[PDB]
Point group: C5
Chain length 311, copies 5
């Protein structure tokens, strides 16, 4: 229980590897996701070297307490990881082969600007603090990085689980720290978004536009205002249950634009009636007639503009 000594001035290279067993509980609101994975660590400790002939065994198994193990920690975890040592094995030269199974709630931010057509890169940061006697540097064993084929996130297509092989070495509180980046690339698999959210919302908006084919101010007030209540009630029904996002999203803009369309529709209805009351049914009829094309066209173009702006 002291770090291994350097042959020359070299730092201790710890070979890492994360193998995802299970990925679950991705909370879009909290920006967290839970993982069940294997963490494999490998380093050279000469104090533990042995001759396979005079020992008989080709590999020696140790208990965590018995030998020096580097203090590897996760940077972005909520509570400290729940680890269980699976195996520790020493090869004749002194190469330790550590493997543990852990579960962790990882904090990784999410970008909803392009929701529900968004892709995310989830991060798992590995860190090691360099000791008094010698410096510790992390390295990636690509043979020890992967994920089980069964690894799923409902409503997401899991593209890849890879690691940024070059560690980000830096000084923190007068000591060296080696930081490794493991990336989980996921893209939204939301198909049912169209018939469940977009299409009913659009039907309600269209229902308001039928007031451009009526002259009954009482039926028109009922149309635009009652559809505005329906629109809001529908949005309470399909609510993301997430706090408001500080930035403007694609879907956020569309919804804003829809509120603006209900507003402008009321203006038209109000004008059409006022012109009729002021015995000017020529202007009242022309406005209503224009609105029949004006509303769908402006809506269609404004959506094309937004879609272009976000994607």
């Amino acid at each position: 229980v002291s770090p291994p000594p350097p042959i020359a001035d070299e730092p201790l290279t710890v070979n890492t590897g994360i193998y995802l067993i299970e990925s679950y509980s991705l909370d879009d609101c909290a920006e967290t996701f839970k993982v069940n994975a294997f963490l494999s660590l490998s380093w050279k400790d000469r104090r533990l070297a042995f001759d396979p002939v005079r020992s008989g065994v080709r590999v020696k198994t140790y208990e965590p307490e018995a030998i020096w193990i580097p203090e590897i920690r996760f940077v972005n975890v909520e509570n400290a990881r729940d680890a269980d040592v699976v195996d520790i094995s020493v090869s004749p030269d002194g190469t330790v082969q550590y493997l543990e199974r852990f579960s962790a709630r990882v904090l990784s931010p999410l970008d909803f600007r392009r929701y529900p057509f968004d892709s995310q890169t989830l991060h798992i940061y590995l860190i090691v603090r360099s000791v008094d006697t010698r410096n510790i540097v992390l390295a990636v064993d690509l043979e020890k990085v992967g994920k089980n084929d069964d690894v799923f996130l409902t409503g997401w297509d899991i593209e890849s689980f890879t690691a940024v092989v070059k560690p980000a070495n830096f000084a923190l509180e007068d000591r060296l720290e080696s930081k490794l980046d493991y990336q989980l690339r996921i893209s939204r698999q939301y198909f049912s978004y169209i018939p469940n959210i977009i299409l009913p919302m659009l039907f309600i908006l269209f229902i308001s536009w039928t007031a451009f084919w009526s002259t009954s101010y009482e039926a028109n007030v009922t149309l635009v205002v009652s559809t505005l209540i329906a629109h809001i009630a529908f949005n309470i029904l399909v609510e993301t249950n997430c706090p408001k996002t500080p930035y403007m999203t694609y879907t956020g803009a569309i919804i804003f634009m829809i509120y603006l369309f209900y507003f402008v529709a009321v203006i038209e209805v109000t004008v059409q009636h006022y012109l009729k009351v002021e015995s000017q049914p020529a202007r009242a009829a022309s406005i209503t007639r224009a609105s029949r094309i004006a509303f769908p066209v402006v809506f269609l173009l404004a959506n094309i503009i937004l879609a272009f702006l976000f994607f």
Copy 2:
């Protein structure tokens, strides 16, 4: 505390068995369910063999620390299982009989495509990682698999708890892994759906269809739009409180179709009025007259089509 040695080159067969005591907290949203069960393990360690004459005892009881126990883990659990060793018993030949009581929150995906007439297969995966000295393989003792008769999940019929006797042996990180599949088959209790959800949502839709027996555009706008609000408010009332499902479900389609029916009903109402204003009460009356049969018939057929498509 070292694995038992092989007679010849054979792997160590560990006989498993899960006996469900309690099943609870099935979360449709989270795709999780909690379990209280017995995990019985049984293997042969010759180092432990005894003569009942020299020992006096017909069976020897050990403490977990005293003997070598295989590291059996669950694949799909959220946090590591809460285990309590009930009993460890060695028979004269060296056959170990381990039994522990555990509780675990198991992650198993759910298929809502046929909801609320759906059946689900809940999974409990047992795994063992092969050691340095020898390979470990899992096997099922069918006498040690079952469930208490009292075992219940409110709103589900618990059909069976069985295990896929042939383990899925595979290589992972240069070591053999032996995986076992325990399946909990449950089917839903869909009767209260009819009076609680289907019938009221239907009454609301029918209330809209009474606009095919009226010529009052003001009363008809009120009918279709106000029932559309009622429909949405009712759906907020019977809300599954689950995130939206990425795939299209049977119930999802019906609801979509209902929104489309409210849309088409507004088109009819609008047309009826426009033809009536444009002094064409022949076409206005004929359309309304058709709609009286057109709407119920198309609805009935479209539902028959969907029911056939999903089931």
Copy 3:
């Protein structure tokens, strides 16, 4: 640390007793409840007997580790109970007197068929698995079963805390099990239900029935449909927040019947108008006049029928 030996062939009788200190968090939805209680165990271990004269002491206090204690477990608990040994005391003849303080989230199903006029029987099942050497049977010490007078569940009258003195001995995985049933009888506090839920729901229904005193189809459509929205919004306001119950409840039936009454009221309104439009104000007036008595009477009788059926 081995079970006590039998004088003859008799099984070991462990005398149990649960004393409720606190009862809390009764979750109607989850079908669980939390408890703080004392669990008192008493058995005869001769290996521990002593002469009070030679020992000069009445009773000898032991530490849990020092002596053999039977593995008593709860059948219906979520996580394993949080136990704290209060006292272990041996009398001269070897009668052990164990007492521990525990807290447990107990899973006990609930029957809402007669809600909110329901009574429930909460269960706490104690179990012991018989060992290799000898069989263990549970017994009830009635002097050690009770509850503190301060024991409360908000919204329930706590009737009794008693135990089914005869244990349910049965075989499980070729070993004997001794199961004891502790019952907590609670009845509901239904008074605030009348002014808070029943009466406003009834006022909303009556408001719709005023359409039987009007001939204005526009005012009548507004009446029945707007009260149908009010009814739903009120139900969202008084929502049980519980997943839907798979079975039909008393309150479930009443609400279903209310939805059917809103439906039939729309039929009347529609008919009355159609007959008036078809210049038949004799039938239109007679139907409306009947409905003024038909609706309250049928509602009153249909309730009487339901109340009789459930109680």
Copy 4:
């Protein structure tokens, strides 16, 4: 690790004291509140007496394991308290000075009858069970009982933290129990109630009363019914999120009375119209004229009656 022996037949007096560091998470629904506090215990165990000359030290510090500490427990806590021993100090005479820092979710019932003008007395019950060798009695050290000035509960004024100095010694399961009552007196902060809840609810109700200045049955149906929906939606907006209270509260009564006022207003509207249709516009006008004063006056009086009844 055995209780201290009595000089004469006296019981062991343990001097207690709770000092609130932080109070938080007061859940009105759950009737629980969380606390961070110091629990100071002091008793004389002569077995621990030392000579300051032979020891060098004027006070000796011990580890919890090393000496006999009385088993002090909380009666009304959800899970067992999270304790951390801060200091254990013995002075030559054998006087032990224990101090711990604990956090606990305390269950104390709440009386909402006078909400939001209510005051509550939160309880923290300390208990000690007497042993075989000698009886243990709790006592209060008033110098060791208080609260930090920073101690806050959002929306409450924290009046006092005091203890009922006379313990409630009683027999339980043939052993003596000494109980101590610590009381946290809090009163509510109710000013934002008026503008946030009471006033908008009253504006909506007044909006309905404008139907006493109109003869349009269609505008009047819309007024009373649409305000009844608004009233309900507003109540969903300001919802306490608490299960229904089994007893009738002050606020509960006001809301009930408001529902009754919407009901009676519909009766007026219905009557006024029926009398007008039955060509009796003398009675129709007189009723409406009365209602203009009848409704505000009866409402004002009925509230005065209720306020008097509850306070």
Copy 5:
């Protein structure tokens, strides 16, 4: 062990420093936030002094058990912090350099008076209780206080992480206490508030004001009342999900004022109609004409007054 001895009469100075690694789960409702940070402690224990020449080593590493470490605690944490000792290092003069990684749910009150244009100062209070042998005082090592650049709280700009260098030394239960204040200054990201909350809420209000351009009492009742329902439904849609704030906020006032504006708008509508019915269309027209400017102007000024009052 035992505290270090003083050279002269001086108190023991413990040099503290908190380095935020992760900040997450800021709950505006619960007035709590979670943190992952390093806690660095440093004091001089002469008992540990050594000669680097005689020792060979320039620094000695110890295990927590081996040496005296001061009991540093947090004042405002929910449960006791989850700590893991990273490193303990003694320099030849006996200066201990302790470093641990902890995670804690910190309770810090929030002031919503200026929401959503608010800034908050989150607190982390460090405390040490003075022992009998000697007094302990906390000090800040400014080189050891900071935050990772990646440290984020969604929807907030993290301004600074600093400590109030002068500790709050005070007496508590006849012992000295040294308190340090660590402050996390955050300001809100209010831009998405305008398009998401302020603008749609405003449109809904303007929709009501169109009743000043209509004489149809039926269309006007529908306008003001239906927009009042829309306003409430929209507020249920954008709900903070936070318990009501005991104090009056800026947004609280605006919303109250909006409810008052819906009320006054109904008064106008009612008056305009009553004057028209009482054949006084001169006053009816003049009021409506004034309201067209009166409502926007008074609203604009009243908002200017409020904005000035809060900011």
